[PDB]
């Protein structure tokens, strides 16, 4: 795998192997983030595997990843949902297109990303990939937002930032509707 | 270092080496749990090291451990506060003396304990042992209870159960 490198104005300049790209010195690159809801409208929260290079063992939103060369961001969402979670989804909706952030993890690994955010519904059962996700929960969005307000340090920082954006949060709410 | 095996009448029957004791088939043994506050009354929440055999990487109450043969519960707390957090404390106070639980961690490791719970105040600065603790936060007890109440899965199951016991929570709250 690789990442797509971006310059200061967020324009692509090339690619780098994925492991080598995440270090204490991470250059800006492209990513995506997605929030998944089941038919009942519950949000899927996940726990990153202990083997993940960045934020291992941390609770976070449904799925995070890196678009590969030739791939649309929405196609990367679909792929990682299948790879990490075994799960089929509805077409991802853009919910926070201009999200961008930089953060250092507990052992000093940096993430530095232009990271558009999406939401979607699951249309199949989960098949969790233990190489990527060690735990998960279906819950009510409102409860997650209250937890995020009370103890933000217990979640990944990108989860918290995305959840605290007003318009993003409105879309998450929309997805809490029960659907048949 | 060991754990103390307990029968149905809660009597020690023997010991097992501590690491070898915690498996997918963990048998009942003695432990303690402790909640630490500073002089200002802020609660210390800690995140277990990724190397811990049970619930690695998990946010939980201040300090947890295993009393040894012939050791008082209060002395075990003090010992682990020094070992894990390099911190001195006031005499531990009982908060939930009859707590007991069993739970399974994401990789299948079980804790199965008789685990009385205590509270204390720190009387020195932390000095972190990174073999035990990978992160920590000083916060307001009110906010931690709301977090436990809203997203209990973000915390260790034993922390949740202690905090959701009606009397334990009163005494934690009264404590600062
Ligand atoms: C999000 C913002 C987290 O850093 C993008 C990266 O997610 P990761 O899950 O860490 O990347 P992948 O390993 O490609 O899945
Ligand atoms: C607490 C309730 C966890 O089950 C008792 C044991 O805590 P640990 O922190 O895991 O024990 P030690 O490694 O002895 O410190
Ligand atoms: Mg990922
Ligand atoms: Mg301990
Ligand atoms: Mn990245
Ligand atoms: Mn134990």
Exposed/middle/buried for residue A11 (C-beta within 10 Å: 0-12, 13-18, 19+): exposed
CA-CA distance, B111 to B66, in Å (whole number)? 11
CA-CA distance, B64 to B157, in Å (whole number)? 13
The CA distances from residue B56 to A134, B51, B135, in Å, are 11, 6, 12
**Which ligand 1 atom is at minimum distance from the Cα of A54?**
10
Q: Is the CB of residue B132 less than 8 Å from the CB of residue B83?
A: yes
Q: Is B135 helix (H, G, I), strand (E, B) or coil?
A: strand
Kindly state the tokens that stand for B123: 């009387």
CA-CA distance, B66 to B113, in Å (whole number)? 10
CA-CA distance, B96 to A22, in Å (whole number)? 45
Q: To which H or E segment does residue B136 belong?
A: strand B133-139
Checking DSSP bridges between strand B93-96 and strand B63-65, what pairing results, if any?
unpaired
DSSP code of B111?
A: E
What are the structural domain ranges in chain B?
1-176
Kindly state the tokens that stand for A73: 């961001």
CA-CA distance, B155 to B48, in Å (whole number)? 11
Place of tokens 């500073």: B38
| Complete edge-to-edge strand list for the sheet that includes strand B12-17 | B12-17, B2-6, B29-30, B110-114, B100-104
Q: Whose CA is nearest to atom 2 of ligand 1?
A: A64
H runs (alpha helix) in chain B: 18-21, 73-85, 141-150, 157-164, 166-175
**Which ligand 1 atom is at minimum distance from the Cα of A63?**
9
A175: number of Cβ within 10 Å: 21
Kindly state the tokens that stand for B84: 């894990």
Q: Which residues line ligand 1 (CB under 6 A)?
A: A 31, 33, 54, 64-66, 80, 111, 113, 115, 158
Header resolution in angstroms: 2.0
Helix axes B141-150, A141-150, angle to 10 degrees: 160
Kindly state the tokens that stand for B6: 């307990």
Q: Is the CB of residue B155 less than 8 Å from the CB of residue B137?
A: no
Positive or negative: CA dihedral B129, B132, B137, B141: negative
Nearest CA in chain B to A105: B135
CATH T-level topology, domain B1-176: Nucleoside Triphosphate Pyrophosphohydrolase (3.90.79)
CA-CA distance, B57 to A9, in Å (whole number)? 36
Q: Determine the CATH number of domain A1-180.
A: 3.90.79.10
3-class secondary structure per residue, chain A: CEEEEECCCCCEEEEEEHHHHCCCCCCCEECEEEEEECCCCCEEEEEECCCCCCCCCCEECCEEECCCCCCCHHHHHHHHHHHHHCCCECCCEEEECCCEEEEECCCCCEEEEECCEEEEEECCCCCCCCCCEEEEEEECHHHHHHHHHHCHHHECHHHHHHHHCHHHHHHHHHCCCCCC
With an 8 Å Cβ cutoff, are A57 and B57 in contact? yes
With an 8 Å Cβ cutoff, are A106 and B135 in contact? yes
Phi, psi of B62 (to 5 degrees): -55, -55
Kindly state the tokens that stand for B143: 């906010």
CA distance A106 to chain B (A): 7
State the structure-solving technique. X-ray
Q: Is B20 helix (H, G, I), strand (E, B) or coil?
A: helix
CB burial readout A84-109, b (16+ within 10 A) else e: bbebebeebbebbeebeeebebeeeb
Instruction: Return the number of CB contacts < 8 Å for A and B.
Output: 62
Residue A63 CA to ligand 3 center (angstroms) comes to 6
* B118 DSSP β-pair partners: B34, B94
Q: Is the CB of residue A168 less than 8 Å from the CB of residue A175?
A: no
Q: Is the CB of residue B56 less than 8 Å from the CB of residue A51?
A: no
With an 8 Å Cβ cutoff, are B155 and A153 in contact? no
Check if A71 is active-site.
no
How far is C-alpha B160 from the geometric centre of its chain's CA atoms?
11
Residues from chain B contacting residue A134 (CB–CB below 8 Å): 106-107
Q: Which of B111, B118, B138, B99 is nearest to B10 (CA)?
A: B99
Q: Is B171 helix (H, G, I), strand (E, B) or coil?
A: helix
Q: Is B22 helix (H, G, I), strand (E, B) or coil?
A: coil
Q: Which of A63, A42, A34, A39 is nearest to A173 (CA)?
A: A42
Q: Is the CB of residue B65 less than 8 Å from the CB of residue B95?
A: no
Helices (H) and strands (E) in chain B, counts: 5, 12
Q: Is the CB of residue B49 less than 8 Å from the CB of residue B59?
A: no
Kindly state the tokens that stand for B119: 């509270």
Q: Could you give the dihedral angle defined by the CA atoms of residues B47, B50, B51 and B54, in that order, rounded to the nearest 10 degrees? A: 70
CA-CA distance, B142 to B112, in Å (whole number)? 28
Kindly state the tokens that stand for A145: 């937002």
Q: Is the CB of residue A65 less than 8 Å from the CB of residue A76?
A: yes
């Amino acid at each position: 795998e690789h990442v797509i490198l971006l310059n200061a104005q967020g324009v692509p300049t090339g690619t780098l192997e994925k492991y080598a790209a995440h270090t204490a010195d991470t250059r800006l690159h492209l990513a995506f983030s997605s929030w998944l809801f089941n038919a009942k409208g519950q949000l899927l929260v996940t726990r990153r595997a202990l083997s993940k290079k960045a934020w291992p063992g941390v609770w976070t939103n449904s799925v995070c990843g890196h678009p590969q060369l030739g791939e649309s961001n929405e196609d990367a969402v679909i792929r990682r949902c299948r790879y990490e979670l075994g799960v089929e989804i509805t077409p991802p909706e853009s919910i926070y297109p201009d999200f961008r952030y930089r953060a250092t993890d507990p052992s000093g690994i940096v993430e530095n990303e232009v990271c558009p955010v999406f939401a979607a519904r699951t249309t199949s059962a989960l098949q969790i990939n233990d190489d990527e996700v060690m735990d998960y929960q279906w819950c009510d969005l409102a409860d997650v937002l209250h937890g995020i307000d009370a103890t933000p340090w217990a979640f990944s920082p990108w989860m918290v930032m995305q959840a605290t954006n007003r318009e993003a949060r409105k879309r998450l709410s929309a997805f809490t509707q029960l659907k048949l």
